[PDB]
Amino acid sequence: STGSATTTPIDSLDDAYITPVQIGTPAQTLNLDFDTGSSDLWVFSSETTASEVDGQTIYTPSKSTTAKLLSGATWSISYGDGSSSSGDVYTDTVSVGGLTVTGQAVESAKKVSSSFTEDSTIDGLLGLAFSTLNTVSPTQQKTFFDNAKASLDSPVFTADLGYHAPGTYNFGFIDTTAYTGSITYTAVSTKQGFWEWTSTGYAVGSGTFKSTSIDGIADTGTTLLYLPATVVSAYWAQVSGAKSSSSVGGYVFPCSATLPSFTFGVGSARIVIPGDYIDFGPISTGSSSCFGGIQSSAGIGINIFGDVALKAAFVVFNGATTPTLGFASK
């Protein structure tokens, strides 16, 4: 079996992508953020503190004939600014683009962090990292992908994110019409629970390619591209007037500048990120300073190939016994 679903940017800057997901019987459709950097499927629900719900579609387990409370199970995900989302756990039927899984753990949020409340277009997250990162206690739960693996024609899912345009998440098959050339596969380390891989180097604009190993994670749930400070400094040195701003918290550049492309290596292949993809617009309404899509990972501790990088490619998440990541131009 297979599944295919359209994913849509939530705003004009491609800050995140939402994908419709059917939960329960009869179906309750929620728009979820598909996140390969986490492993929890959590949703706004009728149990969420009412003051923390601002426009989101909520999941109502009492209206689903197939929902079952998972007795004593709780969940808690921590965020980098001290806030957290948490709640209880149900099991229910979950379908993505025609692909149905029964008995999927659905984590109902009892409280959410303020940043989720502020964003009314995201009804929850669907985690697609490895199940060892799932936070359900005392009994850890499997991801949607892990539960679907046996039913899929092939144990893969692919991410084809659009630039200012809709894209596609496919489960169980590789659409050979969605990319050009060949797919280059690279080894994945699962030791930290992420889709972690090693890029073979980078280039700025039309400059010389720099052979150097960059270990990082493919994370559809992160907007920007976070790379080591040496790489990021080399990129923004080619943009006249760009500088790192402490008040803003990253590199900014004059909005009238034209940005150079950024190339990253996948084995012997090269993925080119057009310069326009790195422009994330004015730091404030009316400002002539613009925020950059390539930022330093020094404060984070891990390099992150976020949406900025992934939407330049057709990306294969191969969940075979030995997992691999595939990149192709498109």
Side-chain angles (χ1 to χ4, degrees), residues 44-50 58-59 61 69 87-90 108-111:
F44 278 82
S45 74
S46 54
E47 306 181 328
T48 313
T49 305
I58 59 173
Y59 163 64
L69 182 104
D88 49 17
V89 183
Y90 292 83
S108 168
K110 277 291 267 287
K111 19 198 208 173

Tab-separated table of all heavy atoms in Angstrom, residues 44-50 58-59 61 69 87-90 108-111:
chain	number	residue	atom	x	y	z
A	44	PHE	N	-3.699	19.525	19.034
A	44	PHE	CA	-4.658	20.287	19.819
A	44	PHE	C	-5.930	19.461	19.964
A	44	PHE	O	-6.308	18.719	19.054
A	44	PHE	CB	-4.963	21.623	19.137
A	44	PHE	CG	-3.940	22.697	19.401
A	44	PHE	CD1	-2.764	22.748	18.666
A	44	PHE	CD2	-4.164	23.670	20.362
A	44	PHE	CE1	-1.823	23.739	18.898
A	44	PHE	CE2	-3.227	24.662	20.597
A	44	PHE	CZ	-2.056	24.697	19.862
A	45	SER	N	-6.588	19.568	21.115
A	45	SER	CA	-7.725	18.699	21.377
A	45	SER	C	-8.739	19.407	22.264
A	45	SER	O	-8.504	20.511	22.761
A	45	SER	CB	-7.273	17.381	22.015
A	45	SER	OG	-6.904	17.571	23.369
A	46	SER	N	-9.887	18.747	22.454
A	46	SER	CA	-10.904	19.242	23.374
A	46	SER	C	-10.401	19.308	24.808
A	46	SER	O	-11.041	19.953	25.646
A	46	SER	CB	-12.154	18.359	23.311
A	46	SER	OG	-11.829	16.998	23.535
A	47	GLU	N	-9.278	18.660	25.104
A	47	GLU	CA	-8.674	18.681	26.425
A	47	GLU	C	-7.689	19.828	26.613
A	47	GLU	O	-7.312	20.117	27.753
A	47	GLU	CB	-7.975	17.344	26.684
A	47	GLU	CG	-8.879	16.134	26.491
A	47	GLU	CD	-8.166	14.834	26.781
A	47	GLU	OE1	-6.947	14.782	26.535
A	47	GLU	OE2	-8.813	13.871	27.248
A	48	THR	N	-7.273	20.491	25.536
A	48	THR	CA	-6.346	21.608	25.662
A	48	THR	C	-6.993	22.752	26.435
A	48	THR	O	-8.165	23.077	26.226
A	48	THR	CB	-5.897	22.097	24.280
A	48	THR	OG1	-5.527	20.978	23.465
A	48	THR	CG2	-4.703	23.034	24.407
A	49	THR	N	-6.224	23.348	27.346
A	49	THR	CA	-6.685	24.506	28.103
A	49	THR	C	-7.219	25.572	27.161
A	49	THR	O	-6.506	26.033	26.263
A	49	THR	CB	-5.543	25.068	28.952
A	49	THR	OG1	-5.000	24.029	29.777
A	49	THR	CG2	-6.042	26.201	29.836
A	50	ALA	N	-8.480	25.958	27.375
A	50	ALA	CA	-9.206	26.756	26.390
A	50	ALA	C	-8.486	28.061	26.068
A	50	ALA	O	-8.510	28.522	24.920
A	50	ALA	CB	-10.624	27.035	26.888
A	58	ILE	N	-9.405	21.331	16.700
A	58	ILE	CA	-9.094	20.437	17.808
A	58	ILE	C	-9.600	19.038	17.491
A	58	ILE	O	-10.591	18.849	16.776
A	58	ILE	CB	-9.683	20.944	19.143
A	58	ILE	CG1	-11.203	21.077	19.052
A	58	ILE	CG2	-9.066	22.281	19.525
A	58	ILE	CD1	-11.856	21.415	20.375
A	59	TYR	N	-8.899	18.046	18.034
A	59	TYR	CA	-9.306	16.652	17.966
A	59	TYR	C	-10.170	16.331	19.180
A	59	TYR	O	-9.776	16.601	20.317
A	59	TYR	CB	-8.067	15.755	17.913
A	59	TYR	CG	-8.280	14.294	18.243
A	59	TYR	CD1	-9.082	13.488	17.449
A	59	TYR	CD2	-7.636	13.711	19.327
A	59	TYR	CE1	-9.258	12.147	17.741
A	59	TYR	CE2	-7.806	12.376	19.628
A	59	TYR	CZ	-8.618	11.598	18.832
A	59	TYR	OH	-8.791	10.268	19.127
A	61	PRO	N	-11.636	13.333	21.071
A	61	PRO	CA	-11.673	11.863	21.166
A	61	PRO	C	-13.043	11.318	21.522
A	61	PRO	O	-13.368	10.193	21.125
A	61	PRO	CB	-10.638	11.536	22.253
A	61	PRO	CG	-10.223	12.825	22.858
A	61	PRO	CD	-10.684	13.957	22.005
A	69	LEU	N	-8.547	5.589	25.287
A	69	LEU	CA	-7.571	6.189	26.186
A	69	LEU	C	-6.517	5.162	26.571
A	69	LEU	O	-6.841	4.031	26.945
A	69	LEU	CB	-8.253	6.735	27.439
A	69	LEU	CG	-7.304	7.436	28.416
A	69	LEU	CD1	-7.450	8.946	28.334
A	69	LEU	CD2	-7.527	6.948	29.841
A	87	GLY	N	0.404	16.274	27.759
A	87	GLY	CA	-0.969	15.824	27.879
A	87	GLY	C	-1.025	14.317	28.035
A	87	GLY	O	-0.047	13.683	28.438
A	88	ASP	N	-2.186	13.758	27.714
A	88	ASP	CA	-2.424	12.325	27.789
A	88	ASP	C	-2.420	11.729	26.383
A	88	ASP	O	-2.200	12.424	25.387
A	88	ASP	CB	-3.729	12.039	28.537
A	88	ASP	CG	-4.887	12.862	28.020
A	88	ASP	OD1	-4.774	13.403	26.900
A	88	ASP	OD2	-5.904	12.971	28.736
A	89	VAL	N	-2.661	10.422	26.305
A	89	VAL	CA	-2.446	9.661	25.080
A	89	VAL	C	-3.691	8.847	24.765
A	89	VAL	O	-4.241	8.173	25.645
A	89	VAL	CB	-1.218	8.735	25.195
A	89	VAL	CG1	-0.965	8.012	23.877
A	89	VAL	CG2	0.013	9.523	25.619
A	90	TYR	N	-4.131	8.908	23.512
A	90	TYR	CA	-5.155	8.024	22.982
A	90	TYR	C	-4.549	7.174	21.875
A	90	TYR	O	-3.474	7.477	21.349
A	90	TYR	CB	-6.350	8.815	22.429
A	90	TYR	CG	-7.162	9.525	23.485
A	90	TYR	CD1	-6.766	10.763	23.972
A	90	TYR	CD2	-8.325	8.960	23.993
A	90	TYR	CE1	-7.505	11.422	24.940
A	90	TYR	CE2	-9.070	9.610	24.962
A	90	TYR	CZ	-8.656	10.840	25.431
A	90	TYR	OH	-9.393	11.490	26.393
A	108	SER	N	-2.857	13.742	22.905
A	108	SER	CA	-3.726	14.893	23.102
A	108	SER	C	-3.058	15.898	24.030
A	108	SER	O	-2.645	15.550	25.140
A	108	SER	CB	-5.067	14.440	23.679
A	108	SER	OG	-5.826	15.543	24.132
A	109	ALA	N	-2.955	17.146	23.577
A	109	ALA	CA	-2.268	18.174	24.345
A	109	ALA	C	-3.194	18.756	25.404
A	109	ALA	O	-4.296	19.220	25.092
A	109	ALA	CB	-1.762	19.284	23.424
A	110	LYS	N	-2.746	18.723	26.661
A	110	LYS	CA	-3.474	19.391	27.731
A	110	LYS	C	-2.995	20.820	27.932
A	110	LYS	O	-3.805	21.700	28.245
A	110	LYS	CB	-3.352	18.601	29.039
A	110	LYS	CG	-4.362	17.461	29.143
A	110	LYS	CD	-5.780	17.988	29.310
A	110	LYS	CE	-6.215	18.112	30.760
A	110	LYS	NZ	-6.481	16.778	31.367
A	111	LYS	N	-1.698	21.070	27.750
A	111	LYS	CA	-1.171	22.423	27.662
A	111	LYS	C	-0.110	22.474	26.571
A	111	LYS	O	0.626	21.509	26.353
A	111	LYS	CB	-0.578	22.915	28.991
A	111	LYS	CG	-0.219	21.833	29.992
A	111	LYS	CD	-0.083	22.439	31.385
A	111	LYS	CE	0.891	21.657	32.255
A	111	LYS	NZ	1.151	22.351	33.550
